């Protein structure tokens, strides 16, 4: 029954400069709320703290070696991070976009199959998107590397095939009952 919080609010609350920054992030990133950003500012701070500790340790130090390499390999599987980075010295010099860039929502834009970070989120939350055998409704997801290619509309949502739409199918029978017969 163990549980933990996933976000952290900023010490302080009114620093125009920070607020604007967050708003630009929501906009580019079809985000919903500040928490939506705060959640990531939080995710990142822990990663950076994880990193900083490690970087203070001796290199070759079974603890530093075994966990450093792991943090890196984890950070790379998600594309968040790259090789020269792909050492700890580079994660220290990293940022939020790099995570934010891997969510669904922005990818469904990023290859035509949405044309909007907008469209993207309503598409995702509405069941028209599988990551290869599996519908994924979590506009919040995190697309892994060799998983980038398997993202596509789903086997039945109409695009993806399958009749029309509880509203399109309404319209077909909308030209049927009146204009066909009585």
């Amino acid at each position: 029954w163990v549980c933990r919080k996933t976000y952290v609010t900023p010490r302080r609350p009114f620093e125009k400069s920070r607020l604007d920054q967050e708003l630009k992030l929501i906009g580019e990133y079809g985000l919903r709320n500040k928490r939506e950003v705060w959640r990531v500012k939080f995710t990142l701070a822990k990663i950076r703290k994880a990193a900083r500790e490690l970087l203070t340790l001796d290199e070759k130090d079974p603890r530093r070696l075994f966990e450093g390499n792991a943090l890196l390999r984890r950070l790379v599987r998600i594309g968040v991070l790259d090789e020269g980075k792909m050492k700890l010295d580079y994660i220290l010099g990293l940022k939020i976009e790099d995570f934010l860039e891997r969510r669904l929502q922005t990818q469904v834009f990023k290859l035509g199959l949405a044309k909007s970070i907008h469209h993207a989120r309503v598409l995702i939350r509405q069941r028209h998107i599988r990551v290869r055998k599996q519908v994924v409704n979590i506009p919040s997801f995190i697309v892994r590397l060799d998983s980038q290619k398997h993202i596509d509309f789903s086997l039945r949502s109409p695009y993806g095939g399958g009749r029309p739409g509880r509203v399109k199918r309404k319209n077909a029978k909308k030209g049927q009952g009146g204009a066909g017969a009585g």
């Binding site: 604007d20 708003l23 630009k24 929501i26 906009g27 079809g30 985000l31 919903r32 709320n33 907008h118």
Partner: protein, 59 residues
Amino acid sequence: KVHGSLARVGKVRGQTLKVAKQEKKKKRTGRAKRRMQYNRRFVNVVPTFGKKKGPNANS
């Protein structure tokens, strides 16, 4: 040192001519509303270097 009155208790609330509610619009659901905010604020929002301006201004 207290004596005095209350006769006047609630004098302004009861004298403040009620106002309609009027109405109009719904403002937008979560993230969409955030989106309108970001475009109105930042895209919109081009700004001039007019030495600034405001959010809840009249003339």
